[PDB]
């Protein structure tokens, strides 16, 4: 706190309290008593723990019947109107389409939909794979994740 | 219809004005104007002006006759005290208070 360093009054002989810095955490516009810091909170899950979690939720998705598997996903031109058209045809509202191979046209077609998520089978994460209600998986992504967990 | 009349931030203190309020709380208005004429304090000046205003509003807005009016309610509330400093001996200050009053007069029949 940007202040002075003098005692605001002397110690003995005034009817006021004992005080020796105007910066004190009990005063007004004094310091925070236990002031914080830029910190790092990164919890460290183990490799086998993270893979066991992903195995657990994939088993839970197939038991709860929410992982619709298809042979491929493909749109011709990047039209989100066509992507929402195709998704209404497939009868889904909240949907995670994790991709077998890279489809930049699907990147462009799903960048603006506010409920659809398009990923890689490698870059998957349990927050997404839990929160999204109907996970659509390419069969190539099934092959890549059977490789990924083994 | 009860006709009200206020005087806000009167330059006197509430404990002083409440004596001259307590004199005429409940009378008829002509007798109250007599009492406040011949009461010799500064609060008599103030509440005589406010009773003049209340009689004038009650006769003009509502249209009632002067003999019918009668001071049912009258009170003096504390107002925003303004704070000065009087310096006194051995260096010490003394914050002195200049109080104010909100004088309300209800007048009806």
């Amino acid at each position: 706190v940007t202040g002075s360093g003098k005692k605001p009054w002397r110690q003995k002989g005034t009817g006021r309290a004992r005080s020796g810095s105007i910066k004190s955490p009990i005063w007004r516009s004094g310091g925070v008593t236990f002031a914080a810091r830029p910190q790092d909170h990164s919890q460290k899950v183990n490799k086998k723990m993270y893979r066991g979690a992903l195995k657990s939720i994939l088993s839970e998705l197939v038991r709860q019947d929410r992982l619709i598997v298809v042979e491929k996903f493909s749109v011709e031109a990047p039209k989100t109107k066509l992507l929402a058209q195709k998704l209404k045809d497939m009868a889904l509202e909240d949907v995670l389409i994790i991709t077998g191979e890279l489809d930049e046209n699907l990147f462009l077609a799903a960048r603006n939909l506010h409920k659809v998520d398009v990923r890689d089978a490698t870059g998957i994460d349990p927050v997404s794979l839990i929160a999204f209600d109907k996970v659509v998986m390419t069969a190539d992504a099934v092959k890549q994740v059977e490789e990924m967990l083994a | 219809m009860e006709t009200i009349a206020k005087h806000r931030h009167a330059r006197s203190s509430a404990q002083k004005v409440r004596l001259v309020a307590d004199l005429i709380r409940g009378k008829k208005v002509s007798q109250a104007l007599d009492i406040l004429t011949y009461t010799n304090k500064k609060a008599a000046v103030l509440v005589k002006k406010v009773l003049e205003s209340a009689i004038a509003n009650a006769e003009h807005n509502d249209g009632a006759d002067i003999d019918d009016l009668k001071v049912t309610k009258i009170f003096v509330d504390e107002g925003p005290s303004m704070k000065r400093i009087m310096p006194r001996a051995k260096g010490r200050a003394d914050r002195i208070l200049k109080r104010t009053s909100h004088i309300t007069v209800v007048v009806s029949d």
Binding site: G13, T14, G15 | M82, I85, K90, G91, R92, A93
Partner: peptide, 23 residues
């Protein structure tokens, strides 16, 4: 206008002992 002539009370200067002390 509105002068608002109410500055803060910086009053206490010092003291002394100056008293017949029981000792």
């Amino acid at each position: 206008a509105a002068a608002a002539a109410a500055a803060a009370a910086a009053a206490a200067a010092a003291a002394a002992a100056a008293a017949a002390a029981a000792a």
